Amino acid sequence: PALTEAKHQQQFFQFRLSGQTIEVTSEYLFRHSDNELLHWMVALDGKPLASGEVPLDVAPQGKQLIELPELPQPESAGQLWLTVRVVQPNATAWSEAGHISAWQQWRLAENLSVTLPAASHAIPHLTTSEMDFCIELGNKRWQFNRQSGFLSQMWIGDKKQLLTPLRDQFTRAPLDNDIGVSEATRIDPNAWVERWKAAGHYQAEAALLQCTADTLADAVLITTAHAWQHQGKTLFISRKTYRIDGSGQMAITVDVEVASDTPHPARIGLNCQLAQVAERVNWLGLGPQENYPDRLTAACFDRWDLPLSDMYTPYVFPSENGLRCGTRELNYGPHQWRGDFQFNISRYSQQQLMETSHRHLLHAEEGTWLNIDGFHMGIGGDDSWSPSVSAEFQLSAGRYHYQLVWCQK
Amino acid sequence: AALLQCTADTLADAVLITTAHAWQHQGKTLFISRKTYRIDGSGQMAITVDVEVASDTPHPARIGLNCQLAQVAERVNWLGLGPQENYPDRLTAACFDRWDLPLSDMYTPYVFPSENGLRCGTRELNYGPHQWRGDFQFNISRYSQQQLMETSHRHLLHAEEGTWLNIDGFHMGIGGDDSWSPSVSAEFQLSAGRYHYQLVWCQK
């Protein structure tokens, strides 16, 4: 995946957008751009609105100003994106015809959705036992395991949707940059993974603090709080609310407090194991390939669609992989998640990835593992023997908050 | 502010008010603000605010609330970065502690009236018989932002009835590399699009 980041950063055309004008700067020293054209597209949340194609004629180290046609007016709510690509019409000694050599994307106009959600003539019915909160709307059921505080099961019709309950996730299946040169028989305290292990990030347990279920005028509101503790110390506090509305959508709100004296958590998100295994993963966000908070710039915002296999990046040494950032919508099987998040969908649990030493020893688990991160620490990479995650990619803000809408589809 | 959503629900031990507003200008939505108020049985009001900023719109100067309190009190007591005026990109001198200043000293008499007196990193604010808790920046004064904006000289300001209180979840840096070309560094610009903050307002 990372190779595409290199390709992007090292491209020979720089682009600067000002209004309707794209300034293209050549970084060629000797050759004039005599086999290139600029293809451009405007899209509204993944929908193509306009496009064009301009012969790109730039002298070595020179500039060309390309003014775009009056760009479409954002029909409805959403964000317009402008994408440009320098394509090489003719094949060369080292490239196929149609080779894309450079690209860049920008945000244009954005319309905020002031549209009110449609009213529904139905209010999820809340049944309360001592074991659970059982919410029923139409053919959908949600079961919150009242002893744990987590959404334990969901039914569609009669099919159980979860294998593992929806829980908070703070750890990462250590990357090579997290491990560095620390070893079982020779520990390097500074390595992130050592700090996390020492802090008990991989051992912290969720103590259910708060647990309530309330009926709203048109919804059910579940509120919980957990203390993630280790050796008597609270590491994380997580307060979550679930709002089941009459359209069958579950709005999840998560607030996290991180103990300031505790090594910054690897991630802040949720995860569960879906019973459903589906073929394709369809999503709106930065892609198509794996991209991380500090390795985003090559990724393009669009509607992507990949067979599930391609969500997993077969690194020889199993570790956390496949994160996709800036996702506004995720479609999988009969589930849709909306909001603004990073996600990682796979057949291996973080635990399995952490334990396994070689790629070929991994075993696809039953169902599908899905991680949805509100926040995620950068991966670093200045060197793999001394913590190289820049401060602005460390989850150091103390208080975190994110929202997620989980509906069928 | 166009009122979009407006509901009031009774919880098992609280009242939950939920509203949404669209801040619009010439047909364009600039901000969407969704707020919830939870009045609990101890008399504390938990306020949650979610803001969406149109990405194509110059980054808002601040993101907060304000009101005008009827009460004028003598001292302002608070837990946060102080004691003197400090801003997102001018914090490092300020010390975190329990501070206490006569209200007059919250106002910084700049000869050319402008926004002044912000205190950042505040976890608790006590004024009169009101207590705000959370994590915010605040600006308490006798002049409205409007009056400050309009007035050309310090000596022309008129202390207004009551007390103006601004509570910011977020606030743009003040800059200062030069005063003739926008010098606010990117990381101090409110450019994240989605914002969220919480505030507890109880008596005391």
Coordinates of C-alpha atoms in Angstrom, one line a residue:
Chain A
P1 CA 0.0 0.0 0.0
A2 CA 2.7 2.5 1.1
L3 CA 4.2 2.5 -2.3
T4 CA 1.4 4.6 -3.6
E5 CA 2.1 7.2 -0.9
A6 CA 5.6 7.4 -2.3
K7 CA 4.3 7.7 -5.8
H8 CA 2.1 10.6 -4.8
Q9 CA 4.6 12.5 -2.9
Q10 CA 7.2 12.1 -5.5
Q11 CA 5.0 13.1 -8.5
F12 CA 6.4 15.6 -10.9
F13 CA 3.5 17.9 -11.1
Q14 CA 2.4 20.1 -8.4
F15 CA -1.1 21.5 -8.3
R16 CA -2.4 24.6 -6.7
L17 CA -6.1 25.4 -6.8
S18 CA -7.4 29.0 -6.7
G19 CA -11.0 29.5 -7.5
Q20 CA -11.5 28.1 -11.0
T21 CA -7.8 28.1 -11.8
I22 CA -5.5 25.1 -11.4
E23 CA -1.9 26.0 -11.4
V24 CA 0.2 23.1 -12.7
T25 CA 3.9 23.3 -12.0
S26 CA 6.3 21.0 -13.7
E27 CA 9.1 19.5 -11.7
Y28 CA 10.9 18.2 -14.8
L29 CA 14.3 19.7 -15.2
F30 CA 14.9 18.8 -18.8
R31 CA 11.8 17.5 -20.5
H32 CA 8.8 19.4 -21.7
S33 CA 5.5 17.9 -20.9
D34 CA 4.9 16.4 -24.3
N35 CA 2.9 13.3 -23.4
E36 CA 0.5 14.4 -20.8
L37 CA -3.0 15.6 -20.4
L38 CA -4.9 16.7 -17.3
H39 CA -8.1 14.9 -16.7
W40 CA -10.4 16.5 -14.1
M41 CA -13.6 15.5 -12.4
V42 CA -16.0 17.1 -10.0
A43 CA -18.1 14.9 -7.8
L44 CA -20.7 15.3 -5.1
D45 CA -20.2 12.7 -2.4
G46 CA -19.1 10.1 -4.9
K47 CA -21.5 11.2 -7.7
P48 CA -19.9 12.5 -10.9
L49 CA -21.1 15.9 -11.8
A50 CA -18.6 17.1 -14.4
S51 CA -15.4 16.4 -16.0
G52 CA -13.0 17.4 -18.7
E53 CA -9.6 17.0 -20.2
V54 CA -7.0 19.5 -21.0
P55 CA -3.7 18.9 -23.0
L56 CA -1.0 19.6 -20.5
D57 CA 1.8 21.7 -22.0
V58 CA 4.4 22.8 -19.5
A59 CA 8.0 23.7 -20.0
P60 CA 10.6 22.2 -17.6
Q61 CA 10.1 23.9 -14.3
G62 CA 7.4 26.1 -15.7
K63 CA 3.7 26.6 -15.1
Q64 CA 0.3 26.3 -16.8
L65 CA -2.9 27.8 -15.6
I66 CA -5.9 25.7 -16.3
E67 CA -9.2 27.4 -15.7
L68 CA -12.1 25.1 -15.3
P69 CA -15.5 25.6 -16.8
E70 CA -18.0 27.0 -14.4
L71 CA -18.3 24.0 -12.1
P72 CA -21.7 22.4 -11.4
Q73 CA -23.6 23.9 -8.5
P74 CA -23.9 21.4 -5.7
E75 CA -27.3 20.0 -6.3
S76 CA -28.1 19.1 -2.8
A77 CA -26.3 18.5 0.5
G78 CA -22.8 17.1 0.5
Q79 CA -19.2 18.0 -0.3
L80 CA -18.0 18.7 -3.8
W81 CA -14.6 17.3 -4.7
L82 CA -12.3 18.2 -7.5
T83 CA -9.9 15.6 -8.7
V84 CA -7.2 16.0 -11.3
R85 CA -5.0 13.4 -12.9
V86 CA -2.1 13.7 -15.2
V87 CA -2.4 10.9 -17.6
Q88 CA 0.1 9.8 -20.2
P89 CA -1.8 9.2 -23.5
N90 CA 1.0 7.3 -25.2
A91 CA 2.9 4.3 -24.0
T92 CA 6.6 4.9 -23.2
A93 CA 9.6 2.7 -22.8
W94 CA 8.6 2.0 -19.3
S95 CA 4.9 2.6 -19.1
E96 CA 1.6 1.5 -20.6
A97 CA -0.6 3.9 -22.5
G98 CA -2.9 5.7 -20.1
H99 CA -0.4 5.6 -17.2
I100 CA -1.4 8.0 -14.4
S101 CA 1.6 9.9 -13.3
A102 CA 0.2 12.5 -11.0
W103 CA -2.9 13.5 -9.2
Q104 CA -4.4 15.8 -6.6
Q105 CA -7.8 16.3 -5.0
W106 CA -9.5 19.3 -3.3
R107 CA -12.6 20.1 -1.5
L108 CA -14.8 22.6 -3.2
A109 CA -18.2 24.0 -2.1
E110 CA -20.1 22.1 0.7
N111 CA -23.7 22.1 1.6
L112 CA -24.7 21.3 5.1
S113 CA -27.7 19.1 5.4
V114 CA -30.3 21.0 7.2
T115 CA -32.9 18.4 6.3
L116 CA -34.9 17.0 9.2
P117 CA -35.1 13.3 9.5
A118 CA -38.5 12.0 8.4
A119 CA -41.0 11.2 11.2
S120 CA -41.9 7.6 11.6
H121 CA -45.2 6.2 13.0
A122 CA -43.5 3.7 15.3
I123 CA -41.6 3.8 18.5
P124 CA -39.1 0.9 19.3
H125 CA -40.6 -1.0 22.2
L126 CA -38.4 -1.4 25.2
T127 CA -38.6 -4.5 27.2
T128 CA -36.5 -4.6 30.4
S129 CA -35.3 -7.7 32.2
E130 CA -32.6 -8.1 34.8
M131 CA -30.4 -9.5 32.1
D132 CA -31.0 -7.2 29.2
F133 CA -32.7 -4.4 27.5
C134 CA -34.6 -5.8 24.6
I135 CA -35.6 -3.2 22.1
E136 CA -38.0 -4.2 19.3
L137 CA -38.9 -2.3 16.2
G138 CA -40.5 -4.0 13.3
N139 CA -38.4 -7.1 12.6
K140 CA -35.4 -5.6 14.4
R141 CA -34.3 -6.4 17.8
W142 CA -31.5 -5.1 19.9
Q143 CA -30.3 -6.7 23.1
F144 CA -28.1 -4.9 25.5
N145 CA -26.5 -7.2 27.9
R146 CA -27.4 -5.3 31.1
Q147 CA -24.6 -7.1 33.1
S148 CA -21.9 -6.0 30.7
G149 CA -23.3 -2.7 29.4
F150 CA -22.6 -3.6 25.8
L151 CA -24.9 -4.2 22.9
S152 CA -24.7 -8.0 22.8
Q153 CA -27.0 -9.0 20.0
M154 CA -29.0 -7.8 17.2
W155 CA -31.6 -9.6 15.1
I156 CA -32.8 -8.9 11.7
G157 CA -36.0 -10.9 11.2
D158 CA -34.6 -13.8 13.2
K159 CA -30.9 -13.8 12.2
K160 CA -28.4 -13.0 14.9
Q161 CA -26.1 -10.3 13.6
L162 CA -23.3 -10.5 16.1
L163 CA -20.9 -13.1 17.2
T164 CA -19.0 -10.7 19.5
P165 CA -20.6 -7.8 21.4
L166 CA -20.0 -4.2 20.4
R167 CA -17.2 -3.0 22.7
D168 CA -14.7 -0.3 23.1
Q169 CA -11.3 -0.9 21.6
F170 CA -8.2 1.0 22.6
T171 CA -5.4 -1.3 21.5
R172 CA -3.7 -1.9 18.2
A173 CA -2.2 -5.2 17.0
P174 CA 1.4 -3.7 17.3
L175 CA 3.0 -2.6 14.1
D176 CA 6.7 -3.0 13.5
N177 CA 7.1 0.7 14.4
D178 CA 5.3 0.0 17.7
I179 CA 7.6 -2.9 18.5
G180 CA 10.9 -1.6 17.2
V181 CA 13.8 -3.5 18.6
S182 CA 12.1 -4.5 21.8
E183 CA 12.3 -8.3 22.4
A184 CA 10.9 -10.8 24.8
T185 CA 14.4 -11.5 26.0
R186 CA 15.5 -7.9 25.9
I187 CA 13.0 -5.1 26.4
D188 CA 13.2 -1.6 25.1
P189 CA 11.0 0.5 27.5
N190 CA 10.6 3.3 25.0
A191 CA 8.9 1.2 22.3
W192 CA 5.2 2.0 22.1
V193 CA 4.2 -1.5 22.6
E194 CA 6.3 -1.7 25.7
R195 CA 4.6 1.4 27.1
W196 CA 1.2 0.0 26.2
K197 CA 1.9 -3.4 27.7
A198 CA 3.4 -1.8 30.8
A199 CA 0.4 0.4 31.1
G200 CA -1.9 -2.7 30.8
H201 CA -3.6 -1.4 27.7
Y202 CA -3.9 -5.0 26.5
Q203 CA -5.2 -6.1 29.9
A204 CA -7.6 -3.4 31.0
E205 CA -11.0 -4.5 31.9
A206 CA -14.3 -2.7 31.5
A207 CA -16.1 -2.1 34.7
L208 CA -19.7 -1.2 34.1
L209 CA -20.3 2.0 36.0
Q210 CA -23.6 3.3 34.7
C211 CA -26.5 1.5 33.0
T212 CA -29.9 3.0 32.1
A213 CA -32.6 2.7 29.5
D214 CA -35.1 5.4 28.9
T215 CA -38.1 5.8 26.6
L216 CA -38.2 9.0 24.6
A217 CA -41.1 10.5 22.8
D218 CA -40.0 8.7 19.7
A219 CA -37.0 6.6 20.6
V220 CA -35.2 4.5 23.1
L221 CA -32.2 5.9 24.8
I222 CA -29.6 3.6 26.3
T223 CA -26.9 5.2 28.4
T224 CA -23.9 3.4 29.8
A225 CA -20.5 4.1 31.2
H226 CA -17.5 2.0 31.6
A227 CA -14.2 2.3 33.5
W228 CA -11.3 0.6 31.8
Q229 CA -9.1 -0.3 34.7
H230 CA -5.8 -1.9 35.3
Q231 CA -4.2 -2.7 38.7
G232 CA -6.5 -0.3 40.4
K233 CA -5.9 2.5 38.0
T234 CA -8.5 3.9 35.7
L235 CA -7.1 4.2 32.2
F236 CA -10.1 5.1 30.2
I237 CA -13.6 6.2 30.9
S238 CA -16.1 5.6 28.2
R239 CA -19.6 7.0 28.2
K240 CA -21.9 5.8 25.5
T241 CA -25.4 6.5 24.4
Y242 CA -27.6 4.6 22.0
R243 CA -30.6 6.2 20.5
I244 CA -32.9 3.8 18.6
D245 CA -35.2 5.9 16.6
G246 CA -38.5 5.0 14.9
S247 CA -36.8 4.5 11.5
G248 CA -34.7 1.7 12.9
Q249 CA -31.5 3.6 13.0
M250 CA -29.2 3.4 16.0
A251 CA -27.3 6.6 16.8
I252 CA -24.3 5.9 18.9
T253 CA -22.5 8.6 20.8
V254 CA -19.2 7.9 22.4
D255 CA -17.2 10.0 24.9
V256 CA -13.8 8.9 26.1
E257 CA -11.6 10.2 28.8
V258 CA -8.0 9.1 28.8
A259 CA -5.8 9.3 31.9
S260 CA -3.2 11.9 31.0
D261 CA -0.4 10.0 32.7
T262 CA -1.1 6.9 30.6
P263 CA 0.7 6.3 27.3
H264 CA -1.5 7.6 24.6
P265 CA -3.9 4.9 23.5
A266 CA -3.3 3.3 20.1
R267 CA -6.8 4.0 19.0
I268 CA -10.2 5.0 20.2
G269 CA -13.0 3.1 18.6
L270 CA -15.4 0.2 18.8
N271 CA -15.4 -3.3 17.4
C272 CA -17.4 -6.3 17.1
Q273 CA -17.6 -9.5 15.2
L274 CA -20.3 -9.8 12.6
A275 CA -22.0 -13.0 12.0
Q276 CA -22.4 -12.1 8.3
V277 CA -19.7 -12.7 5.9
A278 CA -20.3 -10.8 2.7
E279 CA -18.4 -10.5 -0.5
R280 CA -17.9 -6.9 -1.3
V281 CA -17.1 -3.9 0.9
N282 CA -18.5 -0.7 -0.4
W283 CA -17.7 2.6 1.1
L284 CA -17.4 6.4 0.8
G285 CA -14.1 7.7 2.0
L286 CA -10.4 7.9 1.4
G287 CA -9.2 5.0 -0.7
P288 CA -9.1 2.5 -2.2
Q289 CA -6.0 1.2 -0.6
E290 CA -5.0 1.1 3.1
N291 CA -4.3 4.5 4.5
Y292 CA -3.5 5.9 8.0
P293 CA -3.8 9.3 9.8
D294 CA -0.1 10.1 8.9
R295 CA -0.2 8.4 5.5
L296 CA -3.3 9.8 3.8
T297 CA -2.2 12.1 1.1
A298 CA -2.2 9.6 -1.7
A299 CA -5.7 8.4 -0.9
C300 CA -8.6 9.8 -2.8
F301 CA -12.0 10.5 -1.5
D302 CA -14.5 8.6 -3.5
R303 CA -17.0 5.7 -3.6
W304 CA -14.9 2.6 -3.4
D305 CA -15.8 -1.0 -3.8
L306 CA -13.5 -4.0 -3.1
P307 CA -14.0 -7.7 -2.5
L308 CA -13.4 -8.2 1.2
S309 CA -10.1 -10.0 0.5
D310 CA -8.6 -6.7 -0.6
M311 CA -9.4 -5.0 2.6
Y312 CA -6.7 -7.1 4.2
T313 CA -3.1 -6.3 3.6
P314 CA -1.0 -9.5 3.7
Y315 CA 2.0 -8.2 5.6
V316 CA 4.4 -11.1 6.1
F317 CA 4.6 -10.3 9.8
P318 CA 0.9 -10.1 10.9
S319 CA 0.0 -6.7 12.4
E320 CA -2.8 -4.2 12.3
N321 CA -3.5 -3.4 8.7
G322 CA -6.1 -2.3 6.3
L323 CA -7.4 0.9 8.0
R324 CA -9.3 3.2 5.8
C325 CA -9.7 6.8 6.9
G326 CA -12.1 9.6 6.3
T327 CA -15.0 7.3 5.8
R328 CA -18.4 8.8 5.8
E329 CA -20.4 5.7 4.8
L330 CA -19.6 2.0 5.1
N331 CA -21.7 -0.7 3.5
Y332 CA -21.3 -4.3 4.3
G333 CA -23.7 -7.1 3.8
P334 CA -26.9 -5.6 5.1
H335 CA -25.3 -3.1 7.4
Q336 CA -24.6 0.6 6.9
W337 CA -22.5 2.8 9.1
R338 CA -22.5 6.5 8.7
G339 CA -20.6 9.3 10.3
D340 CA -17.0 10.2 10.1
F341 CA -14.6 7.4 11.0
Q342 CA -11.8 5.1 10.1
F343 CA -12.5 1.5 9.8
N344 CA -10.9 -1.8 9.5
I345 CA -12.9 -4.8 8.3
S346 CA -11.3 -8.2 8.2
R347 CA -11.3 -11.9 9.0
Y348 CA -8.8 -11.7 11.8
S349 CA -9.2 -10.4 15.3
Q350 CA -6.7 -8.0 16.6
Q351 CA -5.8 -10.6 19.1
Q352 CA -5.0 -13.2 16.5
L353 CA -2.9 -10.7 14.5
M354 CA -1.0 -9.8 17.6
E355 CA -0.3 -13.4 18.5
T356 CA 0.5 -14.8 15.1
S357 CA 4.2 -14.7 14.0
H358 CA 3.7 -15.4 10.3
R359 CA 1.2 -14.5 7.7
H360 CA 0.8 -18.1 6.6
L361 CA -0.3 -19.1 10.1
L362 CA -3.4 -16.9 10.2
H363 CA -6.8 -18.5 10.3
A364 CA -9.8 -16.7 9.0
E365 CA -12.2 -16.5 11.8
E366 CA -15.9 -17.1 11.7
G367 CA -17.8 -14.0 10.7
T368 CA -16.3 -10.6 10.1
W369 CA -14.3 -8.5 12.4
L370 CA -15.1 -4.9 12.2
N371 CA -13.2 -2.1 13.9
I372 CA -14.6 1.4 13.7
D373 CA -12.3 4.1 15.0
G374 CA -13.2 7.5 16.0
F375 CA -9.5 8.3 16.5
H376 CA -6.4 6.4 15.5
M377 CA -2.7 7.0 16.3
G378 CA -0.3 7.6 13.4
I379 CA 1.9 4.7 12.3
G380 CA 5.2 6.6 12.2
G381 CA 8.1 5.5 10.1
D382 CA 11.2 7.6 10.4
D383 CA 12.9 4.6 11.7
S384 CA 11.8 1.3 13.2
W385 CA 13.8 1.4 16.4
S386 CA 12.9 4.6 18.1
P387 CA 9.3 5.9 18.6
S388 CA 8.7 8.0 15.5
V389 CA 5.2 9.1 15.8
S390 CA 4.9 12.9 15.6
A391 CA 3.0 14.6 18.4
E392 CA 0.1 15.7 16.2
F393 CA -0.6 12.1 15.4
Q394 CA -0.6 10.9 19.0
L395 CA -3.9 10.6 20.7
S396 CA -3.0 13.1 23.4
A397 CA -6.1 15.3 23.7
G398 CA -7.5 13.6 26.8
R399 CA -11.1 14.0 25.9
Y400 CA -12.5 12.4 22.8
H401 CA -15.9 12.2 21.1
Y402 CA -17.4 10.7 18.1
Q403 CA -20.7 9.6 16.7
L404 CA -21.8 6.8 14.6
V405 CA -25.0 5.8 12.9
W406 CA -25.7 2.1 12.6
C407 CA -28.7 1.2 10.6
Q408 CA -29.5 -1.7 8.4
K409 CA -29.1 0.1 5.1
Chain B
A1 CA -30.5 30.9 13.4
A2 CA -33.3 29.0 11.9
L3 CA -34.8 26.6 14.3
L4 CA -34.8 23.2 12.7
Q5 CA -35.6 20.8 15.5
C6 CA -37.3 21.3 18.8
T7 CA -38.3 18.5 21.3
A8 CA -38.6 18.0 25.0
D9 CA -38.6 14.5 26.5
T10 CA -38.9 13.2 30.0
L11 CA -36.3 10.7 31.1
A12 CA -36.4 8.3 34.0
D13 CA -34.7 11.0 36.1
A14 CA -34.3 14.1 33.9
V15 CA -35.6 16.3 31.3
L16 CA -34.0 16.2 27.9
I17 CA -34.4 19.1 25.5
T18 CA -33.0 18.7 22.0
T19 CA -32.8 21.4 19.5
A20 CA -31.1 22.1 16.2
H21 CA -30.4 25.4 14.4
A22 CA -29.2 26.3 11.0
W23 CA -27.2 29.5 10.9
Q24 CA -27.8 30.7 7.4
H25 CA -26.9 33.6 5.2
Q26 CA -28.2 34.5 1.8
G27 CA -29.7 31.0 1.4
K28 CA -26.4 29.3 2.4
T29 CA -26.1 27.2 5.6
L30 CA -23.0 28.2 7.4
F31 CA -23.4 26.4 10.6
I32 CA -25.5 23.6 12.0
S33 CA -25.8 23.5 15.7
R34 CA -27.4 20.6 17.6
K35 CA -27.8 21.0 21.3
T36 CA -29.1 18.9 24.1
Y37 CA -29.9 20.0 27.5
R38 CA -30.2 17.5 30.3
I39 CA -31.8 18.7 33.5
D40 CA -31.1 16.2 36.1
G41 CA -32.6 15.7 39.6
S42 CA -29.8 17.5 41.3
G43 CA -30.5 20.7 39.4
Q44 CA -27.6 20.5 37.1
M45 CA -28.0 21.3 33.4
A46 CA -25.7 19.3 31.1
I47 CA -25.3 21.0 27.8
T48 CA -24.0 19.1 24.8
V49 CA -23.2 21.0 21.6
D50 CA -22.4 19.7 18.2
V51 CA -21.4 22.0 15.4
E52 CA -21.0 21.5 11.7
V53 CA -19.2 24.1 9.7
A54 CA -19.5 24.5 6.0
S55 CA -16.1 23.6 4.7
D56 CA -16.2 26.3 2.0
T57 CA -16.8 29.0 4.6
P58 CA -13.9 30.9 6.2
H59 CA -13.2 29.2 9.5
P60 CA -15.4 30.6 12.3
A61 CA -13.7 32.8 14.8
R62 CA -15.0 30.8 17.7
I63 CA -17.4 28.1 18.6
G64 CA -19.2 28.7 21.8
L65 CA -22.2 30.1 23.6
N66 CA -23.0 33.3 25.2
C67 CA -25.6 35.1 27.2
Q68 CA -26.1 38.1 29.4
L69 CA -26.5 37.4 33.0
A70 CA -28.7 39.5 35.1
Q71 CA -26.3 39.1 38.0
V72 CA -23.4 41.4 38.4
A73 CA -21.0 40.0 40.9
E74 CA -17.7 41.2 42.4
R75 CA -15.2 38.4 41.9
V76 CA -14.6 35.9 39.3
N77 CA -13.2 32.6 40.6
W78 CA -12.0 29.9 38.4
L79 CA -9.9 26.9 37.8
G80 CA -7.8 27.0 34.6
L81 CA -5.0 28.8 32.8
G82 CA -4.3 32.2 34.3
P83 CA -4.5 34.6 35.9
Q84 CA -4.1 37.0 32.9
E85 CA -5.7 36.9 29.5
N86 CA -4.5 34.0 27.4
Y87 CA -5.3 32.6 23.9
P88 CA -5.0 29.2 22.1
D89 CA -1.7 30.4 20.5
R90 CA -0.5 32.4 23.5
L91 CA -0.9 30.0 26.4
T92 CA 2.5 29.0 27.5
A93 CA 3.0 31.7 30.2
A94 CA -0.3 31.0 31.8
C95 CA -0.3 28.7 34.7
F96 CA -3.0 26.2 35.7
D97 CA -4.4 27.0 39.0
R98 CA -7.3 28.4 41.1
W99 CA -7.5 32.0 40.3
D100 CA -9.6 34.8 41.7
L101 CA -9.9 38.3 40.3
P102 CA -12.3 41.2 40.7
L103 CA -14.4 41.3 37.6
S104 CA -12.7 44.5 36.4
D105 CA -9.5 42.6 35.9
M106 CA -11.1 40.2 33.5
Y107 CA -11.3 43.0 31.0
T108 CA -8.2 44.1 29.2
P109 CA -8.5 47.8 28.4
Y110 CA -7.0 47.8 25.0
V111 CA -7.1 51.3 23.6
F112 CA -8.8 50.1 20.5
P113 CA -11.8 48.0 21.8
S114 CA -11.7 44.4 20.6
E115 CA -12.2 40.9 21.9
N116 CA -10.2 40.5 25.0
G117 CA -9.9 38.7 28.2
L118 CA -10.3 35.1 27.1
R119 CA -9.1 32.6 29.6
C120 CA -8.3 29.1 28.3
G121 CA -8.2 25.6 29.7
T122 CA -10.9 26.3 32.3
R123 CA -12.3 23.4 34.1
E124 CA -14.5 25.3 36.6
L125 CA -15.9 28.8 36.5
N126 CA -17.6 30.5 39.5
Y127 CA -19.5 33.7 39.2
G128 CA -22.1 35.0 41.5
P129 CA -24.3 32.0 42.1
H130 CA -23.4 30.1 39.0
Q131 CA -20.9 27.4 38.3
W132 CA -19.8 26.1 35.0
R133 CA -17.8 23.0 34.7
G134 CA -16.2 21.2 31.8
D135 CA -13.3 22.2 29.6
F136 CA -13.6 25.5 27.9
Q137 CA -12.4 29.0 27.3
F138 CA -14.3 31.8 28.7
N139 CA -14.7 35.5 28.5
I140 CA -16.6 37.4 31.1
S141 CA -17.3 41.1 30.8
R142 CA -19.5 44.1 30.8
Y143 CA -19.4 44.7 27.1
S144 CA -21.1 42.8 24.4
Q145 CA -19.1 41.6 21.5
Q146 CA -21.2 43.9 19.4
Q147 CA -20.4 46.9 21.4
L148 CA -16.8 46.1 21.3
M149 CA -16.9 45.7 17.6
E150 CA -18.7 49.0 17.1
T151 CA -16.8 51.2 19.5
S152 CA -13.7 53.0 18.2
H153 CA -12.1 54.0 21.5
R154 CA -11.7 52.5 24.9
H155 CA -13.1 55.6 26.6
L156 CA -16.3 55.4 24.6
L157 CA -17.3 52.0 26.0
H158 CA -20.4 51.7 28.3
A159 CA -20.7 49.0 30.8
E160 CA -23.9 47.2 29.9
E161 CA -26.5 46.0 32.4
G162 CA -25.7 42.6 33.8
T163 CA -22.7 40.5 32.7
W164 CA -21.8 39.2 29.4
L165 CA -20.4 35.7 29.4
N166 CA -18.9 33.9 26.5
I167 CA -18.1 30.3 26.8
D168 CA -16.1 28.8 24.0
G169 CA -15.6 25.2 23.2
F170 CA -13.2 26.3 20.5
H171 CA -11.5 29.5 19.7
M172 CA -9.3 30.6 16.8
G173 CA -5.8 31.7 17.5
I174 CA -5.0 35.4 17.5
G175 CA -1.9 35.4 15.3
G176 CA 0.7 38.1 15.4
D177 CA 3.5 37.6 12.9
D178 CA 2.4 40.8 11.4
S179 CA -0.7 42.9 11.5
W180 CA -1.3 43.2 7.8
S181 CA -1.4 39.7 6.4
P182 CA -3.4 36.8 7.9
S183 CA -0.9 35.2 10.4
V184 CA -2.9 32.6 12.1
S185 CA -1.2 29.2 11.8
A186 CA -3.2 26.4 10.4
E187 CA -3.3 24.4 13.7
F188 CA -5.0 27.4 15.4
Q189 CA -7.7 27.7 12.8
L190 CA -11.0 26.2 13.4
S191 CA -10.9 24.0 10.3
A192 CA -12.0 20.6 11.6
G193 CA -15.5 20.8 10.3
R194 CA -17.2 18.9 13.1
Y195 CA -17.0 20.2 16.6
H196 CA -18.2 19.0 19.9
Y197 CA -18.2 20.2 23.5
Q198 CA -20.0 19.7 26.8
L199 CA -20.8 22.1 29.5
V200 CA -22.3 21.7 32.9
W201 CA -24.2 24.6 34.2
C202 CA -25.4 24.3 37.7
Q203 CA -26.1 26.8 40.5
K204 CA -23.0 26.1 42.5

